[PDB]
């Protein structure tokens, strides 16, 4: 089963053939990170994580399943609210 | 821009072919049976920082 977050947090915080072989699948973990970025109407998102014993790589292991008319209705509400915000209010964020 | 996006859509519609039959594919299920990997539940931002610092 699962494991508390403090352990893997300590794993990443305190830090070689077993360390070398797990580094091959890095862009796959990048893809699994990028396909589960949270929606604008969500504040936090809690996802499962697969991780190596030394913290070599961390995976996401979840497919972003949604119901299609609910998803379209939610993005239409986003469209309405952002039209409302530009007709009411702009400062773009400073990059990196 | 409309005409070029419609060009890409017509190319993706014309070049479409049915995918080849194969065995069902599970990378993370084979990763889970290995004792070198553990599972947990984390916030998105924390694992997003962990992935980029591991890549660095």
């Amino acid at each position: 089963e699962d494991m508390p977050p403090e352990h893997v947090r300590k794993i990443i915080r305190d830090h070689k053939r077993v360390y070398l072989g797990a580094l091959k699948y890095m862009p796959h973990a990048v893809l699994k990170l990028l396909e589960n970025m949270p929606m604008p109407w969500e504040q936090i998102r809690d996802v499962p994580v697969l991780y190596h014993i030394t913290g070599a790589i961390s995976f996401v292991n979840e497919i972003p399943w949604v119901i299609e008319p609910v998803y379209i209705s939610q993005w239409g509400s986003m469209w309405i609210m952002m039209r409302r915000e530009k007709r009411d209010r702009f400062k773009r964020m400073r990059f990196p | 821009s409309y005409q070029k996006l419609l060009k890409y859509y017509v190319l993706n519609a014309l070049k479409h072919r049915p995918p080849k039959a194969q065995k069902k594919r599970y990378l993370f299920r084979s990763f889970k049976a290995t004792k070198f990997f553990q599972s947990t539940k984390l916030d998105w931002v924390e694992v997003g920082l962990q992935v980029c610092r591991q890549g660095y």
Binding site: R17, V18, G21, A22 | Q22, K23, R25, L27, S30, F31, T34, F36
Partner: peptide, 23 residues
């Protein structure tokens, strides 16, 4: 020696999806 054998077994298992058709 054990860890490389485990990752080689996982590589062979990922190659098992198309093994009898490709070779």
């Amino acid at each position: 020696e054990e860890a490389d054998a485990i990752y080689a077994a996982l590589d062979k298992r990922m190659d098992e999806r198309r093994k009898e058709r490709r070779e």
